[PDB]
Design a protein around this ligand. Structure first.
Ligand SMILES: CCN(CC)c1cccc(NC(C)=O)c1
Ligand SMILES: [Mn+2]
Ligand SMILES: [Mn+2]
Lengths: 137, 137
Protein backbone atom coordinates (compact mmCIF):
# COMPACT_ATOMS: atom_id res chain seq x y z
CA UNK A 1 0.00 0.00 0.00
CA UNK A 2 1.00 3.64 0.23
CA UNK A 3 3.35 4.32 3.12
CA UNK A 4 3.81 8.10 3.35
CA UNK A 5 5.10 11.05 1.38
CA UNK A 6 8.04 10.06 -0.79
CA UNK A 7 8.79 13.66 -1.80
CA UNK A 8 7.31 17.13 -2.15
CA UNK A 9 8.12 18.94 -5.40
CA UNK A 10 7.58 22.69 -5.63
CA UNK A 11 7.67 24.45 -8.98
CA UNK A 12 9.77 27.61 -8.72
CA UNK A 13 10.17 30.54 -11.08
CA UNK A 14 13.75 31.47 -10.08
CA UNK A 15 15.89 28.65 -8.77
CA UNK A 16 18.59 30.53 -6.86
CA UNK A 17 16.26 32.67 -4.69
CA UNK A 18 14.17 29.61 -3.90
CA UNK A 19 17.21 27.54 -2.92
CA UNK A 20 18.33 30.45 -0.74
CA UNK A 21 14.92 30.66 0.92
CA UNK A 22 14.69 26.97 1.83
CA UNK A 23 18.37 26.49 2.72
CA UNK A 24 19.51 29.82 4.18
CA UNK A 25 16.31 31.19 5.67
CA UNK A 26 14.48 27.99 6.64
CA UNK A 27 17.62 25.99 7.44
CA UNK A 28 16.94 22.94 5.29
CA UNK A 29 19.85 20.82 4.10
CA UNK A 30 20.92 21.31 0.48
CA UNK A 31 22.16 18.06 -1.08
CA UNK A 32 22.47 18.93 -4.77
CA UNK A 33 21.55 21.60 -7.28
CA UNK A 34 21.63 21.69 -11.06
CA UNK A 35 20.59 24.03 -13.82
CA UNK A 36 16.89 23.15 -13.44
CA UNK A 37 16.39 22.09 -9.83
CA UNK A 38 17.62 21.29 -6.36
CA UNK A 39 17.24 18.53 -3.79
CA UNK A 40 16.96 19.41 -0.09
CA UNK A 41 15.95 17.55 3.03
CA UNK A 42 14.12 18.68 6.15
CA UNK A 43 14.41 15.84 8.61
CA UNK A 44 12.96 12.88 6.73
CA UNK A 45 11.30 15.09 4.08
CA UNK A 46 12.74 15.02 0.56
CA UNK A 47 12.03 18.43 -0.99
CA UNK A 48 12.63 19.01 -4.69
CA UNK A 49 12.65 22.52 -6.13
CA UNK A 50 11.96 22.31 -9.87
CA UNK A 51 12.55 25.28 -12.15
CA UNK A 52 9.33 25.67 -14.10
CA UNK A 53 8.68 28.48 -16.62
CA UNK A 54 4.97 27.95 -15.91
CA UNK A 55 5.29 28.88 -12.23
CA UNK A 56 3.76 32.25 -11.43
CA UNK A 57 4.43 34.37 -8.37
CA UNK A 58 0.96 34.08 -6.89
CA UNK A 59 -0.63 36.37 -4.31
CA UNK A 60 -2.31 34.44 -1.50
CA UNK A 61 -5.76 35.80 -2.33
CA UNK A 62 -5.40 34.19 -5.79
CA UNK A 63 -4.54 30.68 -4.60
CA UNK A 64 -6.60 28.12 -2.72
CA UNK A 65 -5.88 26.81 0.79
CA UNK A 66 -3.44 24.09 -0.34
CA UNK A 67 -0.41 24.43 1.93
CA UNK A 68 2.67 22.71 3.37
CA UNK A 69 3.40 22.71 7.09
CA UNK A 70 6.81 22.03 8.65
CA UNK A 71 7.28 20.70 12.16
CA UNK A 72 9.02 22.79 14.80
CA UNK A 73 9.32 22.34 18.53
CA UNK A 74 7.41 24.37 21.09
CA UNK A 75 10.72 25.80 22.30
CA UNK A 76 11.80 27.04 18.84
CA UNK A 77 8.45 28.10 17.34
CA UNK A 78 8.11 31.72 18.44
CA UNK A 79 11.67 32.84 17.77
CA UNK A 80 11.68 31.21 14.31
CA UNK A 81 8.37 32.89 13.42
CA UNK A 82 9.65 36.24 14.70
CA UNK A 83 12.83 35.87 12.65
CA UNK A 84 10.80 35.24 9.49
CA UNK A 85 8.72 38.32 10.32
CA UNK A 86 11.79 40.47 10.87
CA UNK A 87 13.21 39.22 7.55
CA UNK A 88 10.15 40.58 5.75
CA UNK A 89 8.63 37.21 4.81
CA UNK A 90 5.07 37.73 3.58
CA UNK A 91 2.16 36.08 5.32
CA UNK A 92 -1.15 34.68 4.33
CA UNK A 93 -3.04 33.84 7.51
CA UNK A 94 -3.29 35.06 11.09
CA UNK A 95 -6.13 33.18 12.79
CA UNK A 96 -4.88 30.00 14.49
CA UNK A 97 -7.68 27.65 13.45
CA UNK A 98 -5.55 24.48 13.79
CA UNK A 99 -3.37 25.13 16.84
CA UNK A 100 0.02 26.80 17.14
CA UNK A 101 0.88 27.80 13.59
CA UNK A 102 2.65 30.57 11.69
CA UNK A 103 1.53 31.06 8.07
CA UNK A 104 4.04 32.43 5.57
CA UNK A 105 4.75 32.54 1.84
CA UNK A 106 7.74 31.40 -0.21
CA UNK A 107 9.10 33.62 -3.00
CA UNK A 108 6.57 32.22 -5.50
CA UNK A 109 3.65 32.37 -3.09
CA UNK A 110 3.66 28.72 -2.09
CA UNK A 111 1.68 28.64 1.14
CA UNK A 112 3.87 27.42 4.00
CA UNK A 113 3.33 26.95 7.72
CA UNK A 114 5.28 26.35 10.90
CA UNK A 115 3.27 24.07 13.19
CA UNK A 116 3.82 22.68 16.68
CA UNK A 117 2.20 19.31 17.28
CA UNK A 118 1.29 15.94 15.79
CA UNK A 119 -1.94 14.65 14.30
CA UNK A 120 -2.64 12.78 17.54
CA UNK A 121 -2.27 16.03 19.50
CA UNK A 122 -4.52 17.88 17.06
CA UNK A 123 -7.21 15.20 17.33
CA UNK A 124 -7.05 15.40 21.12
CA UNK A 125 -7.37 19.18 21.02
CA UNK A 126 -10.27 18.89 18.57
CA UNK A 127 -12.15 16.60 20.92
CA UNK A 128 -12.35 19.54 23.37
CA UNK A 129 -12.72 22.28 20.73
CA UNK A 130 -14.06 20.46 17.68
CA UNK A 131 -14.55 21.88 14.24
CA UNK A 132 -18.24 22.24 13.31
CA UNK A 133 -19.81 18.85 12.70
CA UNK A 134 -16.68 16.93 13.62
CA UNK A 135 -16.80 13.13 13.87
CA UNK A 136 -13.91 10.94 15.01
CA UNK A 137 -13.24 7.45 13.70
CA UNK B 1 14.89 24.27 13.54
CA UNK B 2 12.49 22.49 11.22
CA UNK B 3 12.31 18.74 11.80
CA UNK B 4 10.18 17.46 8.91
CA UNK B 5 6.89 17.80 7.11
CA UNK B 6 4.15 18.29 9.70
CA UNK B 7 1.19 18.01 7.33
CA UNK B 8 0.08 18.40 3.72
CA UNK B 9 -3.22 20.22 3.18
CA UNK B 10 -5.05 19.92 -0.12
CA UNK B 11 -7.88 22.30 -0.97
CA UNK B 12 -10.80 20.32 -2.41
CA UNK B 13 -13.93 21.43 -4.23
CA UNK B 14 -16.18 18.61 -2.95
CA UNK B 15 -15.38 16.79 0.27
CA UNK B 16 -17.15 13.47 -0.36
CA UNK B 17 -15.40 12.53 -3.64
CA UNK B 18 -12.06 13.60 -2.19
CA UNK B 19 -12.57 11.44 0.90
CA UNK B 20 -13.58 8.55 -1.35
CA UNK B 21 -10.42 9.01 -3.43
CA UNK B 22 -7.89 9.25 -0.59
CA UNK B 23 -9.54 6.79 1.82
CA UNK B 24 -11.20 4.17 -0.38
CA UNK B 25 -9.22 4.25 -3.63
CA UNK B 26 -5.80 5.15 -2.21
CA UNK B 27 -6.24 3.29 1.09
CA UNK B 28 -5.40 6.08 3.52
CA UNK B 29 -6.76 6.00 7.06
CA UNK B 30 -9.58 8.45 7.82
CA UNK B 31 -9.25 9.77 11.38
CA UNK B 32 -11.83 12.56 11.46
CA UNK B 33 -14.18 14.55 9.26
CA UNK B 34 -16.10 17.79 9.79
CA UNK B 35 -18.39 19.92 7.69
CA UNK B 36 -15.45 21.53 5.87
CA UNK B 37 -12.62 18.99 5.90
CA UNK B 38 -11.04 15.71 6.90
CA UNK B 39 -7.87 14.35 8.48
CA UNK B 40 -6.24 11.22 7.06
CA UNK B 41 -2.92 9.49 7.54
CA UNK B 42 -0.71 7.57 5.13
CA UNK B 43 2.17 6.12 7.10
CA UNK B 44 3.82 9.12 8.78
CA UNK B 45 2.01 11.58 6.50
CA UNK B 46 -0.74 13.69 8.04
CA UNK B 47 -3.02 14.72 5.18
CA UNK B 48 -5.74 17.34 5.56
CA UNK B 49 -8.49 17.80 2.99
CA UNK B 50 -9.91 21.31 3.30
CA UNK B 51 -13.19 22.13 1.57
CA UNK B 52 -12.51 25.36 -0.29
CA UNK B 53 -14.90 27.06 -2.75
CA UNK B 54 -11.85 28.72 -4.33
CA UNK B 55 -10.52 25.34 -5.47
CA UNK B 56 -10.87 24.96 -9.24
CA UNK B 57 -10.95 21.56 -10.92
CA UNK B 58 -7.74 22.25 -12.79
CA UNK B 59 -6.60 20.54 -16.00
CA UNK B 60 -2.96 19.43 -15.79
CA UNK B 61 -1.94 21.67 -18.69
CA UNK B 62 -3.08 24.64 -16.57
CA UNK B 63 -1.11 23.93 -13.40
CA UNK B 64 2.61 24.00 -12.79
CA UNK B 65 4.80 21.02 -11.91
CA UNK B 66 4.20 21.19 -8.14
CA UNK B 67 3.31 17.65 -7.09
CA UNK B 68 3.04 15.20 -4.19
CA UNK B 69 4.65 11.76 -4.40
CA UNK B 70 3.63 8.85 -2.16
CA UNK B 71 5.92 5.95 -1.32
CA UNK B 72 5.12 2.42 -2.41
CA UNK B 73 7.25 -0.70 -2.64
CA UNK B 74 8.47 -1.96 -5.99
CA UNK B 75 6.55 -5.18 -5.38
CA UNK B 76 3.25 -3.32 -4.90
CA UNK B 77 3.71 -0.66 -7.60
CA UNK B 78 2.26 -2.38 -10.67
CA UNK B 79 -0.94 -3.59 -9.01
CA UNK B 80 -1.58 -0.17 -7.44
CA UNK B 81 -1.09 1.53 -10.81
CA UNK B 82 -3.49 -1.02 -12.33
CA UNK B 83 -6.05 -0.20 -9.60
CA UNK B 84 -5.85 3.50 -10.46
CA UNK B 85 -6.19 2.66 -14.16
CA UNK B 86 -9.24 0.48 -13.55
CA UNK B 87 -10.80 3.38 -11.62
CA UNK B 88 -10.24 5.66 -14.62
CA UNK B 89 -7.76 7.94 -12.85
CA UNK B 90 -6.02 10.19 -15.36
CA UNK B 91 -2.24 10.20 -15.88
CA UNK B 92 -0.49 13.54 -16.34
CA UNK B 93 3.07 12.43 -17.27
CA UNK B 94 5.04 9.34 -18.32
CA UNK B 95 8.03 8.21 -16.26
CA UNK B 96 11.47 9.03 -17.73
CA UNK B 97 13.67 9.10 -14.60
CA UNK B 98 15.13 6.61 -12.16
CA UNK B 99 12.84 4.59 -9.96
CA UNK B 100 9.33 3.53 -10.83
CA UNK B 101 6.88 6.44 -10.96
CA UNK B 102 3.18 6.66 -11.83
CA UNK B 103 1.87 10.22 -12.32
CA UNK B 104 -1.84 10.60 -11.61
CA UNK B 105 -4.43 13.28 -10.87
CA UNK B 106 -6.81 13.66 -7.92
CA UNK B 107 -10.44 14.71 -8.49
CA UNK B 108 -9.50 18.41 -8.40
CA UNK B 109 -6.40 18.03 -10.55
CA UNK B 110 -3.84 17.92 -7.76
CA UNK B 111 -0.76 16.34 -9.29
CA UNK B 112 0.15 13.10 -7.50
CA UNK B 113 2.79 10.43 -8.02
CA UNK B 114 3.56 6.93 -6.84
CA UNK B 115 7.33 6.61 -6.50
CA UNK B 116 9.69 3.80 -5.54
CA UNK B 117 13.02 5.00 -4.20
CA UNK B 118 14.59 7.33 -1.67
CA UNK B 119 16.54 10.56 -1.88
CA UNK B 120 19.71 8.57 -1.15
CA UNK B 121 18.97 6.33 -4.15
CA UNK B 122 18.35 9.34 -6.39
CA UNK B 123 21.56 11.04 -5.27
CA UNK B 124 23.58 7.87 -5.90
CA UNK B 125 22.20 7.65 -9.44
CA UNK B 126 22.89 11.36 -9.99
CA UNK B 127 26.49 11.05 -8.81
CA UNK B 128 27.06 8.42 -11.49
CA UNK B 129 25.19 10.39 -14.18
CA UNK B 130 24.90 14.02 -13.11
CA UNK B 131 22.28 16.32 -14.54
CA UNK B 132 23.43 19.36 -16.50
CA UNK B 133 25.12 21.80 -14.15
CA UNK B 134 24.89 19.46 -11.18
CA UNK B 135 26.84 20.21 -7.99
CA UNK B 136 26.74 18.19 -4.76
CA UNK B 137 27.06 19.47 -1.19
C1 LIG C 1 13.88 34.95 0.32
C2 LIG C 1 14.82 36.15 0.35
N1 LIG C 1 15.27 36.47 1.70
C3 LIG C 1 14.60 37.58 2.38
C4 LIG C 1 13.50 37.11 3.30
C5 LIG C 1 16.27 35.73 2.32
C6 LIG C 1 16.89 34.68 1.65
C7 LIG C 1 17.87 33.93 2.28
C8 LIG C 1 18.24 34.22 3.58
C9 LIG C 1 17.63 35.26 4.26
N2 LIG C 1 17.98 35.59 5.59
C10 LIG C 1 18.58 34.81 6.52
C11 LIG C 1 18.79 35.47 7.85
O1 LIG C 1 18.93 33.65 6.30
C12 LIG C 1 16.63 36.00 3.64
MN1 LIG D 1 -2.00 23.71 8.18
MN1 LIG E 1 8.29 13.55 -8.45
Amino acid sequence: MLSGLNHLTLAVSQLAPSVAFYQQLLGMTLHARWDSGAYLSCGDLWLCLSLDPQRRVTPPEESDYTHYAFSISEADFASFAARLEAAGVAVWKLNRSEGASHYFLDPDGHKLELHVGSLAQRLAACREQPYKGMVFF
